[PDB]
Design a protein around this ligand. Structure first.
Ligand SMILES: O=S(=O)(O)c1cccnc1
Ligand SMILES: O=S(=O)(O)c1cccnc1
Ligand SMILES: O=S(=O)(O)c1cccnc1
Ligand SMILES: O=S(=O)(O)c1cccnc1
Ligand SMILES: O=S(=O)(O)c1cccnc1
Lengths: 396, 726, 394
């Protein structure tokens, strides 16, 4: 019944892994800083109307353990009634938090919800939380666990994506991320990180290499034994995996956080909030878990049928650039026009902070829909274990 | 909980001395070997009860044996009968066994194992429960946990204790995953044994001496295992340790890479029990190990491997196929005709046993190249420290290369290994038959040609026989003895005894075209080439062979066999039925072989076959293969490709068991496993029938059903024979 | 706010105790897989491709419980790879928040059939094993005056005036009702025994129960780090001394367990041939002293469903601490014959991430056994949170 609207969508800059500016910043501080920015934009916002804070986090241990969403509610002085819940659906945790916030508003049992994600990979590396699919030999031996890297190389092999093909996309991502920054596209959405004294720590995406060349990408070397033979035991018609993915055509390991304010139409009226976009539909699906990175394609199909739309009804497509082959396969499968796909760059140039990425690229499309005065955008991410989440937003 | 389970003669002798040291002497009066059977469990239960009751007058314990071996194996005759409904009994039995060893391990006083001989499986698990292990360095003594070779796991604490002693990785790779056997010197090198003695008479004295010093020097830690002290640190860390957790997810994938995806659950269960046990206390780890053991014993693969590698392999060594009522006959000089890869390996394994070998070829340069095969095998054996410089000289000195037929004087055992051709074999035998001893065995390493025909080229047909080896001879354990129509029983027993002398396993085959190994391996390769002609992807065919459990994929094996030889076998098979007025249905693989020969890709020897060979090294499949056979036009389920290769060999074994080519299922199972590489999890090409399991069910009826299903889809060659019906 | 969400199945494992527990050898992933196999056994023709998500609550998602335990369950059980799988943590009410999130996914129309529940093997992954952003940041921990749940419960008993014998009287009541519920067969069809890979029994009852508890035995127990008592009284400055009345005998037990709930739309139930057992009427979320969160969350869920206290037939509040339940009973005048009628966490245990789904399935069964209409389930939370849910028997 109730329609979920996006009122605010902000994010931190993405600090790089080695000698990154955000390494000295606890992941809790990254979220609190975004909360304070929302207050600056709406000083008379009745925070008592906020019923939940939903944060995606893939490695909820150490600095990110103990329900970091509740920690942000308490540390930022929000009312103790604002809840706080952490969730983990691997790469699409940030987008699942936004969709869960939207589905909470649609059910009529929640009126105004904050959602997003946070990941400080330089302080909490991925895999720090352990896991059963890797550290239980009985179930690991059965499900044939294979890292996302080999699965991405397997996709390039089957589809015929050469080393030059994936590197060509990686260059395109660098060029479009540079044009977006130099063009001021991110001026209002990227909230610079500062210390307790107000000193600047980071105000831009450190991982970007705007002077990338195809010759430089071709010099990079491609990314524990056994995983290569295990993948071919299932995909038995393939003789050899062509390893095309490097650090230059795969997503970057960065730190960052993102926040989205979602509420009903009546909630926006009571608080003087102008809606920016509307959540049209959300969907979840998946494909094989040995190759993975293939769940978003049927999730995109599922979210289109549910909203009664087709590819030609969508103005912008945003797929997380975990690996270049996954995006190129997604483009071939649905015949996505090149000028509609990741128009402001992606995680290859700017980084992939796991639990926050989904909310970041979601906020990116909200801004690009307004800047272009376009109508609809589709946001989707590939997921480990073979999952996929998709969302359609409509400009308001 | 008790030390007893739920009549049998006592196994353990009790002896307490004036110092208070109790000596438990294991001596099962119902056999020459101490076995972890129901008599032992009841005996150790009474002994352990007595140690607790008399704890106030006991200062140490020495576990010893009165046999030539310390303690070897368990009750296979009982384990092979355990049904899935018996999982509760099997669980309680191994829990009672480990409850006895845990009490002995935690008596508060030192326990020393005096290992006088072989301590294998349950025998080593008893010694591992002791705080100190002393081994006598005698000939034939071995130590290890070879439960995995029977499809089992060390369920008497072997997994839990070796992991506590060496860590997860070292225990799995070096002890548990493959059941490696160690000589007493190597056992101490890796920490499986603490010290050595020169003879068995020093053991119990040294055991009591160690107890006396341990009580005096280490009074607080006496009788306390390392994993029972505070501050125990598992070597290599626990799964929660950051260093081990970095590589731990790769352990199942590395295991799946080594096993090539073959369906053998025992290594998987050992790895799971090892890791899961390292996450909890010792007792809970021990109970987890019990559940994984009961999982394997009640399974079918363990029954297949217990049948093949215990019962069948024993019946063969006991002279099952050896003719009864024939005495021993010595061998003094062996004469090998031909210095190829086969003839050189035959000369090596014969001289390594201790026989004097005369290696004849047509030129001295060729015979010298044959001995170079032995010299290069001794060079690799010295560089890795597996032999001495003195034994290598005595080995090579027994190999006398030659090029003259006169050097075959005094030879009483001839083994011909020339090129596969009847006229060439008739020629080289007539030259030397009058120069060897009048009772000399005239053997032939032919693989397909009938023995009865080859025996006509000599006068002493009663001593002509087939002695079929497998390349490489130095590493292949089977010898296929083929009995011609004129071959006597004495010649059969003499070749039988020779096979054991060189350390190889024999099978006895009645004369026929292709014998048993060459004929059954023909159906396996033919099925793969048939699938290639049908349009199945070559990579899928190779995957099906590896995941079925074969040591080498079938297309790769076809190149090592040469398609030229493969075509000659089919032409001889057709001519062997056409010249009898019979009917011959060509295999679909014949058309594939002929087209590859037409293309000049006849195998690895030519330099090109189904694979590409650059500098004598295989380097990927031939790219033109997919366009030649329309690869991809047929995509059957992988299990169909696997079953087609397994069922073809199983059905051919049944035929040549009904035709009388084979005389026992033990020869069929061990022959298929050790001869041509039939997957060991099946238990052999004959055991595969009685142990098949699928969606239909398990047993001979399930095999017949699946075979009829394959026949309806892929051809009447999969129709089950009459002998398998009721 | 259109599609109605129904409960079709609600099962749980028995709860194994912390010290020398039967479930210590069982991985938490296997506790969930065992419940999934039970659902298959009860519906062998269920098209699992209709299941769109599996939502598991887990408070300590580290070690054996890390890496999205819900996705591990989907893959390990052989469920369709399109069934998703997500882990969430909202402290004690994670199991109920997973059920509520599953119900809200069905209401939005964007999901048809969802599995929901929780898992917590506390004997393997103890509470706090995941660390925490608050505990590892003294600057935040200093400003946000942090006091453990144990002291806040003692502070509630001090302010409300609950004596040591008052809280121990409730602990005796919980042990008695839990024993009566087990003897009467109330849990026969909802508690699924845990078995090993050979079918052998591991556990079939709540082994934390002490059905022979007496008033005298509870009085002999001693009350459960420095500073936290002074930090609490710095906020509640009008209180002089905190009366420590909570022991291990009147507080929730540390146990292992899991629970699964199948939630779907009316169309999904008809399509798969499933009988709806109850209907999700409403959910709500609101809340130094902690544990005072479920009182506004209950009023909010009653106000949201247009009901009052007199309309509810059964009240189920998690027995984290005896004083928390007694305050809840006093603040809303809950009749004693309606409050935790089958016992609670004091007797049977509190497996954190699974408790919310366990006590929900407890009320689905008791509503049908009594032929009653409505029930209310709520849990207190650390940090000051609270979740409540109203169900109606179908
Ligand atoms: O490795 S193969 O040569 O089998 C292959 C398979 C599929 C697509 N390209 C290549
Ligand atoms: O049953 S055991 O695995 O101990 C064993 C012992 C001796 C030879 N084969 C197997
Ligand atoms: O994983 S290992 O490389 O130790 C292994 C295990 C079983 C057979 N061969 C090798
Ligand atoms: O199944 S048979 O081996 O009889 C066969 C079938 C088709 C072509 N040649 C032979
Ligand atoms: O005496 S105290 O200040 O601890 C107290 C006692 C009862 C209720 N409120 C406060």
């Amino acid at each position: 019944s109730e329609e979920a609207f996006i009122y605010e969508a902000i994010r931190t800059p993405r600090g790089k892994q080695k000698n990154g500016s955000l390494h000295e910043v606890k992941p809790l501080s990254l979220v609190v800083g975004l909360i304070d920015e929302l207050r600056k934009r709406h000083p008379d916002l009745d925070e008592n109307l906020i019923s939940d804070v939903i944060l995606g986090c893939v490695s909820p241990v150490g600095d990110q353990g103990g329900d970091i969403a509740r920690a942000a509610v308490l540390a930022s002085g929000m009312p103790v009634t604002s809840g706080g819940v952490q969730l983990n659906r691997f790469c699409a945790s940030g987008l699942e938090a936004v969709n869960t916030a939207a589905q909470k508003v649609r059910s009529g049992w929640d009126d105004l919800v904050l959602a997003g994600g946070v990941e400080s990979m330089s302080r909490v590396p991925m895999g720090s939380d352990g896991g059963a699919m890797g550290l239980d030999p009985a179930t690991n031996y059965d499900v044939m666990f294979v890292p996302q890297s080999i699965g991405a190389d397997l996709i390039a092999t089957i589809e015929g994506f050469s080393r030059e093909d994936v590197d060509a996309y990686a260059l395109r991502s660098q060029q479009k991320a540079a044009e977006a920054w130099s063009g001021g596209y991110f001026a209002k959405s990227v909230v610079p990180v500062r210390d307790q004294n107000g000193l600047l720590i980071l105000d831009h995406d450190e991982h970007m290499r705007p002077d990338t060349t195809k010759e430089g990408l071709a010099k990079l070397k491609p990314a524990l034994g056994g995983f290569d033979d295990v993948a071919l035991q299932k995909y038995h018609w393939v003789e050899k995996i062509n390893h095309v993915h490097t650090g230059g055509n795969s997503s970057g390991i960065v730190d960052g956080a993102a926040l989205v304010m979602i509420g009903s139409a009546a909630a926006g009226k009571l608080q003087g909030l102008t809606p920016r976009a509307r959540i049209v539909a959300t969907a979840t699906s998946g494909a094989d878990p040995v190759i993975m990175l293939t769940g978003p394609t049927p999730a995109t199909r599922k979210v289109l049928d549910r909203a009664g739309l087709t590819v030609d009804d969508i103005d912008l497509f945003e797929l997380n650039e975990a690996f270049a082959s996954v995006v190129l396969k997604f483009q071939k499968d649905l015949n996505i026009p090149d000028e509609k796909l990741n128009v402001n760059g992606g995680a290859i140039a700017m980084g992939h902070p796991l639990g926050a990425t989904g909310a970041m690229i979601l906020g990116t499309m909200v801004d690009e829909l307004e800047r272009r005065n376009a109508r609809r955008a589709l946001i989707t991410l590939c997921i480990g274990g073979g999952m996929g989440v998709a969302t359609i937003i409509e400009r308001v | 909980s008790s030390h007893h389970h739920h009549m049998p003669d006592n196994t353990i002798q009790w002896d307490k001395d004036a110092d208070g040291i109790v000596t438990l002497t294991m001596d099962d009066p119902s056999g020459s070997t101490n076995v972890m059977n129901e008599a032992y469990i009841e005996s150790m239960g009474k002994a352990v009860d007595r140690l607790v009751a008399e704890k106030d007058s006991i200062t140490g314990v020495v576990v010893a044996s009165a046999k030539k071996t310390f303690f070897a194996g368990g009750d296979v005759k009982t384990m092979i009968q355990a049904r899935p409904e018996d999982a509760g009994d099997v669980f309680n039995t191994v829990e009672t066994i480990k409850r006895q060893l845990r009490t002995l391990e935690t008596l508060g006083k030192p326990v020393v194992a005096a290992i006088n001989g072989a301590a294998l499986g349950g025998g080593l698990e008893i010694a591992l429960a002791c705080h100190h292990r002393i081994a006598a360095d005698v000939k034939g003594s071995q130590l290890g946990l070879p439960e995995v070779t029977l499809g089992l796991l060390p369920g008497g604490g072997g997994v839990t204790r070796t992991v506590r002693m060496f860590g997860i990785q070292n225990a799995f790779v070096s002890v548990l995953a493959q059941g490696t056997r160690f000589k007493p010197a190597k056992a101490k090198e890796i920490g499986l044994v603490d010290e050595l003695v020169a003879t068995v008479e020093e053991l119990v004295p040294a055991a009591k001496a160690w107890i006396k010093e341990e009580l005096k020097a280490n009074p607080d830690g006496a009788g306390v295992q390392p994993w029972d002290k505070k501050g125990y640190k598992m070597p290599g860390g626990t799964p929660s340790s950051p260093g081990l957790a970095a590589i731990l997810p790769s352990f199942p994938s590395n295991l799946r890479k080594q096993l090539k995806g073959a369906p053998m659950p025992a290594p998987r269960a050992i790895l799971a029990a090892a890791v899961e046990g390292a996450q909890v206390d010792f007792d809970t780890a021990s109970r987890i190990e019990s559940r994984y053991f009961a999982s394997l014993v009640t399974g079918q693969v363990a029954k297949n491997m217990m049948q093949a590698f215990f019962f069948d392999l024993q019946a063969i060594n006991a002279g099952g196929s050896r003719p009864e009522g024939i005495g021993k006959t010595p061998i003094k000089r062996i004469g090998v005709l031909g210095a190829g890869m086969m003839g050189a390996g035959i000369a090596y394994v014969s001289a390594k046993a201790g026989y004097e070998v005369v290696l004849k070829d047509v030129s001295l340069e060729a015979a010298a190249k044959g001995k170079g095969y032995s010299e290069k095998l001794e060079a690799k054996a010295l560089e890795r420290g597996r032999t001495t410089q003195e034994r290598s000289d005595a080995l090579l000195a027994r190999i006398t290369p030659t090029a003259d037929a006169a050097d075959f004087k005094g030879v009483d055992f001839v083994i011909e290994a020339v090129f596969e051709n009847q006229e060439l074999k008739h020629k080289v035998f007539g030259e030397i038959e009058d120069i060897v001893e009048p009772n000399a065995i005239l053997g032939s390493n032919t693989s397909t040609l009938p023995i009865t025909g080859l025996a006509t080229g000599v006068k002493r047909q009663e001593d002509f026989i087939g002695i079929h080896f497998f390349s490489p001879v130095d590493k292949m354990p089977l010898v296929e003895i083929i009995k011609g129509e004129k071959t006597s029983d004495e010649a059969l027993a003499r070749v039988f005894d020779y096979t054991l002398a060189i350390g190889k396993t024999p099978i006895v085959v009645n004369d026929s075209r292709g014998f048993f190994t060459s004929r059954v391996i023909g159906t396996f390769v033919n099925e793969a080439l048939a699938m290639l002609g049908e349009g199945v992807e070559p990579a899928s065919i190779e995957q099906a062979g590896s995941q079925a459990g074969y040591p080498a994929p079938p297309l790769q094996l076809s190149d090592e066999l040469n398609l030229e030889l493969m075509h000659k076998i089919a032409v001889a098979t057709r001519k062997g039925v056409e010249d009898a007025g019979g009917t011959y249905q060509p295999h679909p693989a014949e058309a594939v072989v002929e087209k590859m020969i037409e293309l000049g890709r006849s195998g690895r020897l030519k330099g090109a076959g189904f694979y590409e060979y650059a500098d004598g090294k295989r380097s990927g499949l031939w790219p033109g293969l997919r366009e030649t056979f329309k690869s991809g036009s047929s995509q059957p389920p992988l299990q169909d490709m696997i079953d087609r290769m397994l069922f073809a060999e199983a059905l051919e074994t049944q035929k040549c068991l009904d035709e009388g080519v084979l005389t026992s299922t033990a020869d069929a199972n061990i022959g298929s496993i050790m001869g041509i590489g039939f997957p060991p999890w099946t238990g052999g090409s004959a055991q595969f029938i009685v142990g098949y399991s699928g969606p239909a069910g398990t047993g001979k009826a399930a095999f017949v059903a699946r075979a009829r299903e394959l026949a309806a889809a892929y051809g009447d060659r999969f129709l089950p024979p009459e002998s398998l019906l009721s």
